């Protein structure tokens, strides 16, 4: 656990406090560009929301299993997944937004789907505004994830 001091319980608690502490200092456009980069596999761990997403990704430690799962979906299932998930960015449920982001990341780990969909995802993520859903729910979400995955 490079770049982690204590356990993941402590880590997810601490990073969730940093998120709420720093969220207003981060311009929406920058936040959204960082999100796109996390999905396209260039983390800017400087952004606490990204460090949060990164840590969550690792905890879910499901990358090999998820690659096989995605590799075996057809194009309709992928389009369906992209479109459904994306609406989370317009709604009020933070778990669903984090989920969307991670799921898009797994889809873009497949080079055929990254080629086809990377540009449209980048363009549309640029128009979202999720700061309120983050402020309102990050602490609770962090608690639920610790209780689910790390108990």
Numbering used by the authors: 13 to 163
Q: What did the study's authors say about this model?
A:
VACV protein A49 prevents translocation of NF-κB to the nucleus by sequestering cellular β-TrCP, a protein required for the degradation of the inhibitor of κB. Unexpectedly, the structure showed that A49 possesses a Bcl-2-like fold despite not sharing sequence identity with known cellular or poxvirus Bcl-2 family proteins. Strikingly, despite a lack of sequence conservation with known family members, A49 adopts the Bcl-2 family protein fold comprising five α-helices wrapped around a central helix, α5 (45). The A49 structure shows that A49 lacks a surface groove compatible with binding BH3 peptides and is unable to bind the proapoptotic proteins Bax or Bak.
A truncated form of A49 lacking the N-terminal 12 amino acids (A49 Δ12) was thus expressed and purified. It crystallized readily in two distinct conditions, and diffraction data were recorded to 1.8–1.9 Å resolution (A49 Δ12 ammonium sulfate and A49 Δ12 sodium malonate). Residues 13–17 adopt three distinct conformations in the 10 A49 Δ12 molecules observed in the two crystal forms (inset) and are disordered in one of the two molecules of A49 Δ12 per asymmetric unit in crystals grown in the sodium malonate condition. In four of the eight molecules of A49 Δ12 grown in the ammonium sulfate condition and both molecules of A49 Δ12 grown in the sodium malonate condition, a single residue (Gly) of the C-terminal purification tag is observed; in the structure of full-length A49, the final two residues (161 and 162) and the purification tag were not ordered and could not be modeled. Visual inspection of the structures of A49 Δ12 and full-length A49 showed that, in all cases, two molecules of A49 self-associate via an interaction of helices α4 and α6 (the “4-6 face”). In the structure of full-length A49 this interaction is formed by crystallographic 2-fold symmetry, whereas in the structures of A49 Δ12 the interaction is formed by pseudo-2-fold non-crystallographic symmetry. In the structures of A49 Δ12 salt bridges Arg136–Asp92 and Lys103–Asp139 are formed, although these bonds are not symmetric and thus formed only once per pair of A49 molecules. In A49 Δ12 hydrogen bonds are formed between the side chains of Asn88 and Tyr102 and the carbonyl oxygens of Thr128 and Val95, respectively, and between the side chains of Arg136 and Asn96, although again these interactions often occur only once per pair of A49 molecules. Additionally, we observed that A49 crystallized much more readily upon removal of residues 1–12.
